[PDB]
Structures are given as C-alpha cells and as structure tokens.
Amino acid sequence: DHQLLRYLLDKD
Amino acid sequence: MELTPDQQTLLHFIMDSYNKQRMPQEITNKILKEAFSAEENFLILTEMATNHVQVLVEFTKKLPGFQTLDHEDQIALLKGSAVEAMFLRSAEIFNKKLPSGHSDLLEARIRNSGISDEYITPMFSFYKSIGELKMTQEEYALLTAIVILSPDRQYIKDREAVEKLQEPLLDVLQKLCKIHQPENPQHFACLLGRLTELRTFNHHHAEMLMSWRVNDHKFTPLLCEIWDVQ
Numbered sequence: 001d002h003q004l005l006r007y008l009l010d011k012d
Numbered sequence: 013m014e015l016t017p018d019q020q021t022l023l024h025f026i027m028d029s030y031n032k033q034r035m036p037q038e039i040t041n042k043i044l045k046e047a048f049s050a051e052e053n054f055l056i057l058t059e060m061a062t063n064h065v066q067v068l069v070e071f072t073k074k075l076p077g078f079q080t081l082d083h084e085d086q087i088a089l090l091k092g093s094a095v096e097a098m099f100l101r102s103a104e105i106f107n108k109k110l111p112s113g114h115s116d117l118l119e120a121r122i123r124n125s126g127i128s129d130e131y132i133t134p135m136f137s138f139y140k141s142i143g144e145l146k147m148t149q150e151e152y153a154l155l156t157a158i159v160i161l162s163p164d165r166q167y168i169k170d171r172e173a174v175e176k177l178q179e180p181l182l183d184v185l186q187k188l189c190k191i192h193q194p195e196n197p198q199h200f201a202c203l204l205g206r207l208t209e210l211r212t213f214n215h216h217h218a219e220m221l222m223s224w225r226v227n228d229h230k231f232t233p234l235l236c237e238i239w240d241v242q
C-alpha cells in the first residue's frame with residue numbers, strides 16, 4: 001500500500 | 013549540434029522546477045554549525061529526506077508527459093528513483109563550493125554522522141567521482157529527470173511510454189556535454205555510467221539505514237512508503 005504517494009501524485 | 017528552440021525551452025523549464033529544492037547552503041550551514049549525536053543526525057536525515065521526497069514528487073509531475081502515464085507506472089517510477097535522486101542531490105550538495113576548510117569539516121561531520129563504516133567508503137567514493145565530473149546545475153537537473161524516467165524500473169507495465177519521455181532529456185544532456193565539454197569526449201557516457209553506482213545504493217538502502225548507530229530507527233509515514241523500511 002502506497003496511499004501517501006498516490007495522494008501527492010493525484011492532488012491539484 | 014546546438015540546442016533547438018524546443019530543447020532550450022525544455023531545459024529552462026526543467027531547471028526552474030529543480031531549483032524549488034531546499035537550498036544547499038541551508039543544509040550545509042546546519043551540519044557545519046555544530047556537531048550532533050548519531051541520534052540527532054538520524055532525525056536530521058529523516059526530516060531532510062521527507063522534504064526531498066515531497067519536492068521530488070512536485071518535480072516529477074512537472075516532467076513533460078509524466079501525468080499522461082498509467083497511474084501504477086507513475087508510482088513504480090517514484091519508488092524506483094527516490095533513493096537514487098536523494099543520493100545524487102546529496103552528491104551535488106557535497107561538491108558545492110564552500111569557504112576555505114569548510115568542505116573538510118563537512119566531510120568529517122558526514123563521516124561521524126552515525127552511518128556504519130562499511131557504507132562510508134562507497135558513499136564518499138561516489139561523491140568524489142561526481143565532484144571530478146564538475147557538473148553544472150543543468151546537468152544535475154537533467155540527470156535527475158533521466159533517473160526518474162527510467163523505463164527498466166521494476167513493475168513498469170508500459171516501458172515504451174517511459175522511453176518516449178526519457179529520450180528528449182537524454183538528447184538535451186548529450187548536446188550540453190558536446191557544447192560545453194568538447195575536450196572531454198566521454199563526459200556524457202561518464203554521467204550515465206555514474207547511474208550504475210546510484211542503483212547499487214538503491215539495492216542496499218534498507219541495510220544502510222538500519223545499520224545507523226542509533227537505538228531506534230524511526231521513519232516518517234512518507235519514508236516508509238517510498239523506502240523498504242518498517
């Protein structure tokens with residue numbers, strides 16, 4: 001699981 | 013031979029995104045100021061590395077075509093390159109010009125930081141070899157983009173899509189080496205050859221971190237995701 005990385009990539 | 017207008021545009025854009033990183037002087041001032049224990053140095057490393065990953069993701073999303081890539085491939089590229097880009101940035105900082113005697117103190121501070129003796133020799137060998145290449149800021153920025161956009165990274169589904177994005181960056185870098193260093197005909201090849209040492213650091217990153225002379229190896233949740241720890 002890599003939720004923080006996914007969040008940083010998908011934000012804005 | 014000369015950069016085309018599109019290549020000049022690409023290089024200026026890459027350079028602006030790269031300069032959003034924590035300034036080298038901010039990092040070296042802290043290390044040179046006073047001696048810290050191995051415990052304090054490990055916390056300094058985790059805070060520096062967490063900020064580096066944050067800025068790295070921002071730099072990565074700005075690379076032409078990165079956001080058009082498959083979402084799983086995007087994650088695989090970030091995970092495959094974070095440690096490598098971190099060591100390249102560390103090498104860049106290590107080799108930045110400082111006042112007389114400051115570089116010796118910086119090296120002495122890193123040598124006694126807490127890292128195991130087994131990993132100091134390859135780290136400093138890599139830093140010194142990077143230093144000998146006398147790379148410009150443009151070369152560090154382009155080499156970082158090339159490292160991030162590596163098609164042969166583990167778990168990549170569509171390598172051709174990654175290849176297509178890496179190729180114009182490799183082309184710009186090669187032209188810069190030919191224009192600014194005709195006296196060193198292997199400059200481009202040596203920059204790329206240096207990437208094999210970066211891959212070795214990535215292969216043993218967990219062992220290097222766990223061998224730090226500290227009682228507890230506490231990592232931030234972001235570092236746990238990007239690195240093979242906890």
Ligand SMILES: O=C(c1ccccc1)c1ccc(-c2nc3ccccc3n2[C@H](C(=O)NC2CCCCC2)C2CCCCC2)cc1
Nearest residue numbers: 053056057060061064101102105106122125127217220221
């Ligand atoms: O063991 C390491 C490691 C890290 C990640 C994965 C695996 C191993 C490992 C250990 C030191 C250095 C390292 N080489 C440096 C060269 C010059 C200046 C500082 C440097 N550092 C550390 C640092 O802050 N690095 C930043 C640099 C900006 C980008 C994020 C990282 C500090 C940490 C406090 C004590 C002194 C050195 C670099 C790396």
Ligand SMILES: [Cl-]
Nearest residue numbers: 186197200201
């Ligand atoms: Cl060449």
